[PDB]
Amino acid sequence: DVTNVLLKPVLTEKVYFNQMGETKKYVFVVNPKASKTRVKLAFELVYGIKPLKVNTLIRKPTTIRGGSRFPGLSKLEKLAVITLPKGIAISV
Amino acid sequence: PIKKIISRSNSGIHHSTVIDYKKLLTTNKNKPEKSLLVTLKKHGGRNNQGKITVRHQGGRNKRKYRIIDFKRTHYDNIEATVKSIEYDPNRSCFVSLITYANGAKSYIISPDGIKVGDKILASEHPIDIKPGFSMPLAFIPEGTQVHNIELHPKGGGQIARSAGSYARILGQDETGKYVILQLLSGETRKFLKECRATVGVVSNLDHNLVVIGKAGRNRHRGIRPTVRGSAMNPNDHPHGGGEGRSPVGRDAPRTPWGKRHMGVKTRNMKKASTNLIIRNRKGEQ
Amino acid sequence: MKRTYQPSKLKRAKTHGFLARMATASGRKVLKLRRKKQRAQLTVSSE
Amino acid sequence: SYINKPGKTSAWRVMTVRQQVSAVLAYGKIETTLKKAKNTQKRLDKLITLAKVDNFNNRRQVKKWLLNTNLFDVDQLMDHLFSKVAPKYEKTPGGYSRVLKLGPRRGDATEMAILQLTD
RNA sequence: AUGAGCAGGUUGAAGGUUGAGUAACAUCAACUGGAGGACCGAACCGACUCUCGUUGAAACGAUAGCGGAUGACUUGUGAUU
RNA sequence: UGAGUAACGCUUGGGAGUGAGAAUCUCCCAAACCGAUUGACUAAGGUUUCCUGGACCAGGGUCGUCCUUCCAGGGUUAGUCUGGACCUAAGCUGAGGCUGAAAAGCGUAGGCGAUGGACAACAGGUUAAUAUUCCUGUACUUACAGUUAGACUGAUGGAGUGACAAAGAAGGUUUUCCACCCCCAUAAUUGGAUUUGGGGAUAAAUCAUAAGGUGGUACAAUAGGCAAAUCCGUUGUGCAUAACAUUGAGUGAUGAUGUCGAGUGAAAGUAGCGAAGGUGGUAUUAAUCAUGCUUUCAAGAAAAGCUUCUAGGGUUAAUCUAGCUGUAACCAGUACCGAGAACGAACACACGUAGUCAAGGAGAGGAUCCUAAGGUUAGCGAGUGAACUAUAGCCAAGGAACUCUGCAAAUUAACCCCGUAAGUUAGCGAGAAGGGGUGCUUAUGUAAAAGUAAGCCGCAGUGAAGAACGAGGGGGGACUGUUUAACUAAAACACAACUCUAUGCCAAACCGUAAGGUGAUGUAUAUGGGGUGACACCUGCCCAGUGCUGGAAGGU
Ligand SMILES: [Mg+2]
Ligand SMILES: [Mg+2]
Ligand SMILES: [Mg+2]
Ligand SMILES: [Mg+2]
Ligand SMILES: [Mg+2]
Ligand SMILES: [Mg+2]
Ligand SMILES: [Mg+2]
Ligand SMILES: [Mg+2]
Ligand SMILES: [Mg+2]
């Protein structure tokens, strides 16, 4: 409920391609230590719409900046898609 | 009795033999009763440290220990009845599945002669002498074949329970207690008169006449190759080394370790049981 | 031919892992030595 | 060295000749190495001179050499040949193709040449 | 400890049944049965020979042959000395 | 310096296009190899190597507009898949404790530990990248609350089941297959065609059916199952031949007015459109029933789980079963490669790496040759065709004269048919040796085919590809096996068997200081150790010396 489990929404062409359907599957990146029940409860508290389904995945850190004399590591983040009832939509 | 196996597999010749298992057993199908089976974990010659303490022991098949009642204590003056005679992989002899009147199944070591439907009893009062009966040695008359003897009273039949073994009664001692026994292999001992036993020789008398033909059969039986000393190197064995088929060098043959081996007495004389011995397969004490 | 390093991350973790090196006194001693040398990859637990 | 490429076996040589002459019939010009055009020209001339009769036997003989191309399949290439290429050469005794030399390639300095046929 | 694998095709034991035979045995003939650290031979395992290679393709290999190939077999995973 | 020398570590040709630059990039057409695999799905392993756009410093044994390289952006979606929240095997760890200068070692209750057990989801579609996860269609499972009907519920404990070896054979069942039929396109300039080519399908799930398989059955007594049991076990009685219980491949219907579908095809072979989507047999094929059955001995996991039993509870009720309404279903993996370029080999290294799918022709076959589905252009080329090297092909006459030796190479080779000696442990020798036939057509063959007859052709008829060369005598080891990874595979080691020796259980021997453990949950028909090494016949003399055992007087 602290709403420290909704870090950011991501807007990619795949996300839009899913948006021009009818379920309007909104997606977010969430606190990796959180869970699907916490994510859906937070979504209910922040918008007021009870979600239909939640699916999650996490992107493992990888080598970034290649060979540049100072290579680093990427960010480990969890993405949580949030389906909705067919006849509803909301902004972000 | 043994049944000769004719291989006719044209790669060498082997005159192997095997106990008949057909006219001696009953219900030759391997269908043991469930309630008294516990699996044996094959130590494989090794030890809790994981090292090898006993050489050439490993590779046996997977067995299931048949819980055998040696003590014969919880059931007294309650009649039983032999149900079948199976082949027990763990030991050389044959096991009978008996059934007491109350309805508690158990395994005992089958004396030779018994068949399905016979009736046996075990108690502490003077009873009959038919094979399978059990009673303290103080009541058994002299001369009868006896097995499943134990050293300490209420201890369970450690002594003389192998296939085709027995022991002859030889009366009592002059002290009144310590009834004298003529154990197999010449040794004569003294047993307390309150020790239990069972009359009748042990069945499967022809386990000695078997002739294992193939090496693989022996290996499946749990035995591994034994490398002689003369094949060894001068390290790892006192008989090793030598530039080809050397004879034993030292004064006397040696063990893999330095201990003297041939013809050397090794029993510990300072055991309380020494007073119980009359002859030790060669001579007095 | 079959070389001498067939990888299996489970075996690596159970053998050289941190908790494996925290099981015996000698493991604690070698951990102390590695802290003294300040090695960044202290154990195989860190990639 | 014991194992090696199959190399330029007789079958590979004659199949390359087949492919090149088929391509010449299809298009009319080829940019290939000079010392391959100088060999292909023989079979090219033989096929051109053999096709000035249009009997079924000559078409059967021609079948032994042609290979289908993106522009023309084998049967359509036969029809093209025996219908318009051979009539163009009904009075020239031999020498139906010319092999002129280009500049060397930057890759291998090999001496590319054009195998071309015209009256 | 726990699983897995052995393309295919041969040979036809013991035992049993039937009949003969025997006073009863033994033994003989036909049918059944399908055994073997059995056979031939792919995957698999191994390394007996020649050549090549020896700053090699390779810190032990390649073509060609070669031996075993239902077992004292081969192999994955886990544990231990 | 060696030196612009060896080497560049399994293969092509052409058209068009881009671009400054083209053998090496893109597209197109062929071509050649792989095709029991370079084809497809994955475990482990790697950790972004995946997709799109851009770049060609560096890396690519050459070039580069291009790359598994570099830069920018993007991509993995699970109540049902793999693992955890369930269960234990080997084993690990281990409160107390035992043991040990100290550190520590062993070990009990407990707790972990899959390579195994139990457990609910299928077909299709969709993107550049994911799909039993997303979407459509259809379902299933478990909790939780309420409601309705019925019923007394029964554990942390007991019992049953769970629950298992190897080999082999037969049978049911659809399949493969064949034949017929249906549908679609196809009618051919090179001589003759009145055909040729392709396709003929559907899941989980619910209901009914179900060939079969498994195994006495019901009643009455109970002195056993830490405690009680109606359960199990035990004992009698009648019925027994099928009844009962249990399980069961497949079949039928819905699922499906759907999807797929040969092809047709516009803006791409793509969107779309898309016909038939069957009959009978089978002396062949696989897969299931099957954790079924038979035989043999080397006698073939545990726990959880499921059913049941009472205990204990409930009674002014709980709890369970069934239906209906409603709510919920957690965490981690999900990309890609999976190998002659992403892993282990320092490499874009000819090497190694578990499992699964495994088409056609001849073929017993996954052997062999050419191919189907599908994939590739072995990341230096072009010339010449000298010596010389390697790998092939062949060689007249002779046929081991070579040589340390027939090393190497050469002959035979498949199926069918005659024919097979000495010796022997009577099993073998033995595919012994030595010979004959195979092609095609017609006829006859039977159920197919082998077989048979007639005829024809060639030098040749498993016309190619894949198939044992034997004979005789001797030494050794009885035999199958194992052995010096990376110079020695044998006469060496082991082996079944023989003998001797030790050991009566807290056994001898062994690891450890010791607890403790192996020996062994075994008991002299057993176990440890030395020596010989099937089998057949034998194993002679010497106890002076040494070793061992025994000895009781004396000396030291
Ligand atoms: Mg040069
Ligand atoms: Mg020079
Ligand atoms: Mg030179
Ligand atoms: Mg060179
Ligand atoms: Mg490879
Ligand atoms: Mg593999
Ligand atoms: Mg094939
Ligand atoms: Mg092949
Ligand atoms: Mg010897």
Residue numbers in the entry:
A (entry chain s): 2 to 93
B (entry chain a): 2 to 286
C (entry chain 0): 1 to 47
D (entry chain m): 2 to 120
Paper excerpt:
The ribosome consists of a small and a large subunit (30S and 50S in prokaryotes), which form the aminoacyl (A), peptidyl (P) and exit (E) transfer RNA (tRNA) binding sites at their interface. During the elongation phase, the ribosome undergoes a fundamental cycle to add one amino acid to the nascent peptide chain, which can be subdivided into three steps: decoding, peptidyl transfer and translocation. Here, we use these technical advances to perform large-scale structure classification and spatial analysis of ribosomes, to visualize parts of the translation process in great detail inside M. pneumoniae as a prokaryotic minimal cell model.
Focused refinements on the 30S and 50S subunits improved the map quality and revealed well-resolved ribosomal RNA (rRNA) bases and ribosomal protein amino acid side chains. The high-resolution in-cell consensus maps allowed us to build de novo an atomic model for the M. pneumoniae ribosome. Specifically, 11 of the 52 ribosomal proteins in M. pneumoniae have extended sequences compared to E. coli. Most of these extensions are predicted to be disordered, but those of ribosomal proteins S6, L22 and L29 form secondary structures and were built in the model. We found such extensions to be common throughout the bacterial kingdom (Supplementary Discussion and Supplementary Table 2), possibly representing ribosome diversity in adaptation to different environments and lifestyles.
